[PDB]
């Protein structure tokens, strides 16, 4: 469904994601898709907004992830929407 090259993507995220990043990793400049997707999963289960029993679904409309993303909760396993969620706040980089 989704390849595995899509992880190598290089971002530079805008503001408020880097914000979100910052609270979790090492600040810089360009980051990968993986590395973007790791902070945001640790950023998610750190503060316990991952409700693994009952439905799998994230549930972020108290928290910054939910103005990033502009929904009150989605399921991870939705990983095209989450993409796309994640691309509107980055630029990619070549
Ligand atoms: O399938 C999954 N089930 C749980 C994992 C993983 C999911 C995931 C992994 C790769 C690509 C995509 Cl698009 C993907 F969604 C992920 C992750 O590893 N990083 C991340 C980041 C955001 Cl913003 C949302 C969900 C996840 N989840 C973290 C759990 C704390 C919710």
Known sequence: Q???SEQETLVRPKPLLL???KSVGAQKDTYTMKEVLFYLGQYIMTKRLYDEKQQHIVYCSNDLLGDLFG????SVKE???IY???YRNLVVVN
């Open 84 to 86: 796309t969620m994640i």
């Open 2 to 4: 989704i390849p595995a």
């Open 19 to 21: 914000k979100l990043l």
């Open 79 to 81: 990983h095209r929407k």
């Open 71 to 74: 929904v009150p909760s989605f």
